[PDB]
Design a binder for this molecule. Structure first.
Ligand SMILES: NC(=O)c1cccc(CCN(CCC[C@H](N)C(=O)O)C[C@H]2O[C@@H](n3cnc4c(N)ncnc43)[C@H](O)[C@@H]2O)c1
Ligand SMILES: NC(=O)c1cccc(CCN(CCC[C@H](N)C(=O)O)C[C@H]2O[C@@H](n3cnc4c(N)ncnc43)[C@H](O)[C@@H]2O)c1
Ligand SMILES: NC(=O)c1cccc(CCN(CCC[C@H](N)C(=O)O)C[C@H]2O[C@@H](n3cnc4c(N)ncnc43)[C@H](O)[C@@H]2O)c1
Ligand SMILES: NC(=O)c1cccc(CCN(CCC[C@H](N)C(=O)O)C[C@H]2O[C@@H](n3cnc4c(N)ncnc43)[C@H](O)[C@@H]2O)c1
Lengths: 269, 244, 267, 243
């Protein structure tokens, strides 16, 4: 189609998985969302980083292992977490995305430049280190780069990992879940990776039915904050903290109505 | 081949095809006789060789124009309109619509009201900006298309374009009535396999809105054709209005 | 709370159950919704739909249970042609009293005869209004308290497994969230035979409805949430319709209504 | 009684200690990371406390502290005037200094706040002129923590109070509110006070009806001890006054 519906959605109503293997360009995605001055995208990124900073450095969400689900090609969402977690596992469905991440982990000269984001977080954190040291500390924290599929009851396949203290997921489950029972199942699937009492940290868009990568359109599940809270509690978690902001992406990039952050814990049997 | 289609999809005797036809007849009865879809001119698009989709409509439209891509299909229509002995036997279908209508009428009266209402039998192509070519027609109250556009459009942009082309035959505020297959990529006539656009309901909604219509009513049923004839997963019916 | 939020919702965010005993006035509700207008058009569509379901589509059997009847009976008129026995239910005792008055043809009851005449016209004028009303009155065997949020929605009252469960404009008002809604559909499933029919009609994307100046909570679901909830509850949808007609702005903020017919799955 | 309140609510590893730390972290975020800043902040229902102005004084040149109770204001002024009978806020002052990067130590922070507070006034949020006859220039930000729940006997009064507060604000100025959710009472020693048990949706409806657009809204589940209040969590919001 030609913008009539999201790519890979004509038959099913929702962007198929294969669309993320064929048409998700990580370089274009990074160029569009993480790369002029005080744009909507810039403001959203600052708010995300401030929240991750507050969750991981001021609120002391911490432990041995953190798993980042649906990382895409980005690493901004780990910069503060690596201060509180000894080991980070990064995951995405897209092999293209895993490639971009591993290039950045190798500090390949062709990889995306996160320096401005890194400097921002370092300044949030008090300027105790400069950018380079913060980047290398994250590179060292990232122990595994893995394929994942949230809709599967073992989201990482037969890949054995110790139970994690935290699962983080930014801007992923909306794009990954074609309906609210799938969403809830995905949250339950993520639960299989968590220690009892582990932390679930989700950031995503509210009421977004698509997002753009340039002229390429991808489905989003348009959930309100009540639907998100419902799904999280049904999936077996208790919510400690739940926030909404009005700031939205530019219309040329998504039709979201704000974003949410939440911190939850996996309940008892 | 028009008769082969009639034999396979409108055979009589229970069957998935019987059930689909009955639900088609009941939705059109609802649209044209209980609901307020009426007017002076109705145009049916992609009629093929069939008349079942006109049985309730002729109760509400003074004049009807039947169109299709295949002249061979239109010859088959005309055999029934001229009541040739070999023409397809639609009386069990005429009977079932009459009973839906309260047996207000009997078969023969129903068949003659349809023959009188059908005023023109035209060649058409939904992908052209003028779907009827240089044949002029007054602006129509209603355009009707059953099981046509999925077969006619090889992709979703064409589908949207077709809906706009059809709109050019429609007054502002006129009715668009469409019934078609959902998620069907092929349908069979004998062992001849034809292509279909396998679109879901969200894509239909998106195409209709984008072509300049607002949807009044949209229904989907789960009943499909049997495996030997099409791989659809249900059917939709919708009634839309042409925006200004 | 002075309209700022629905009555009974200030603490929880959703109209409490007790509010339906205190503040839901049957006669006011009937005057407001069931007396052209957006409300009349909606009623006409509901009646044409119930006509198609029970008379043309052959949805039929021994026992139908109507859930959340309120004080109304329009939703049973076509049904009593296809069902030997009808059981009506509502959470509100005031509603049940209004129904009992109409069932005994109390002279002070609400007059359904124009609605009755309309349905007799839909059905072919085979009979006139009075005969049809008396067929319905004889068909209604029980009037029962119900609470859709409890796993036995009719409590300990024994009934044979029903052939159909009908629910018009109720579940939205009754369920404060998606999980209660899906659980309520499961509860309703307990009253149905396997392969039994579930027929729901309700508003789309409605967060409140008005009776005069009284504001009641509604659960604002879209068509995909509804389809998802029904399927998780153990049903398979046979047909699902949406219409764009909504209540006038002073009554509710809905964006259309839906109708569906479903069947309780094999186990 | 203002000193009993202070000893009970703001003196180690308890539900109250947890709530206070959440309040300070959110105040720090709003005023030092989010860039809520300007000329004049008006603190509404301050009681005898100052913790809620520690971060704010970094971003506003002038602060006005207000309360319904004269006793509360005299307790507060005892701290502004560095009287020896004042509550010792130093553990709290230290925590905020630690939140801000230890750019300063306490005594500097303490002095920064004392010269920012320009007036100590009476206020009643239910009156259309909450500060009575005292004229103030239009404020950039109105801050109220744990006040409105205690002050309003019902939701319409809650909403009216929020409009009254807006009469002090410039159009496009900030409203910053933190309060209890679903609390009907709170305890000061043996003495029981009444609270409006608002849910979060009621808070949002009241705020928008009073003529603000909400930029962010956060709820936390953490509650006071049962011996203190029967709240079920807390909320924070930052809203803008519409024109
Ligand atoms: N909702 C929106 O409107 C919306 C608005 C703006 C931006 C985005 C980004 C959407 N995008 C994620 C950004 C990545 C990074 N964490 C970040 O914060 O920027 C979607 C990601 O989800 C993965 N994904 C797909 N299906 C998956 C599956 N079944 N199992 C596991 N993973 C899956 C895709 O690989 C892709 O990395 C969505
Ligand atoms: N999708 C399916 O799974 C599917 C399932 C079951 C059956 C069918 C048959 C589809 N077929 C017949 C329907 C006829 C009649 N209205 C009826 O309800 O039976 C489609 C008709 O559409 C015409 N047509 C082609 N291209 C055209 C064009 N460009 N411009 C205008 N017209 C065009 C063909 O001549 C043919 O008459 C498809
Ligand atoms: N969604 C809307 O915007 C909306 C818009 C317009 C009108 C309405 C009416 C909503 N209202 C009346 C429908 C009555 C009748 N069947 C009819 O179609 O008119 C809902 C009925 O649901 C009952 N009910 C409450 N809680 C219950 C419980 N826990 N268990 C069982 N039952 C319960 C109430 O007593 C009330 O009779 C809602
Ligand atoms: N809700 C709860 O469960 C709850 C839980 C725990 C604690 C509290 C305390 C409630 N109480 C103290 C907050 C003080 C300080 N800002 C702080 O964050 O500690 C509220 C203050 O609000 C003032 N106040 C009353 N009516 C007023 C009016 N009409 N106009 C203006 N002002 C008014 C009273 O003088 C009192 O100082 C309530």
């Amino acid at each position: 189609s030609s913008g009539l519906v999201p790519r890979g959605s004509m038959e099913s109503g929702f962007t198929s998985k294969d669309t993320y293997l064929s048409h998700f360009n990580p370089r274009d995605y990074l160029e569009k969302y993480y790369k002029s001055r005080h744009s909507a995208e810039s403001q959203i990124l600052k708010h995300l980083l401030k929240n991750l900073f507050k969750i991981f450095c001021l609120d002391g969400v911490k432990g041995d292992l953190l798993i980042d689900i649906g990382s895409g090609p980005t690493i901004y969402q780990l910069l503060s977490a690596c201060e509180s977690f000894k080991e980070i596992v990064v995951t995405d469905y897209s092999d293209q995305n895993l490639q971009e991440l591993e290039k950045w982990l190798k500090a390949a000269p062709a990889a995306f430049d996160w320096s401005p984001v890194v400097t921002y977080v370092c300044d949030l954190e008090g300027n105790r280190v400069k950018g380079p040291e913060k980047e290398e500390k994250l590179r060292q924290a990232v122990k595994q780069v893995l394929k994942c599929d949230v809709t599967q009851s073992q989201p990482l396949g037969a890949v054995p990992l110790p139970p994690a203290d935290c699962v983080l997921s930014t801007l992923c489950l909306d794009a990954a879940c074609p309906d609210l029972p799938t969403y809830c199942r995905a949250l339950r699937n993520l639960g299989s990776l968590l220690k009892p009492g582990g932390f679930l940290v989700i950031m995503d868009a509210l009421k977004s039915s698509y997002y753009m990568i340039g002229e390429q359109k991808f489905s989003s599940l348009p959930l309100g904050r009540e639907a998100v809270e419902a799904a999280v509690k049904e999936a077996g978690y208790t919510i400690e903290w739940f926030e909404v902001i009005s700031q939205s992406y530019s219309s040329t990039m998504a039709n979201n109505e704000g974003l949410f952050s939440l911190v939850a814990r996996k309940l008892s049997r």
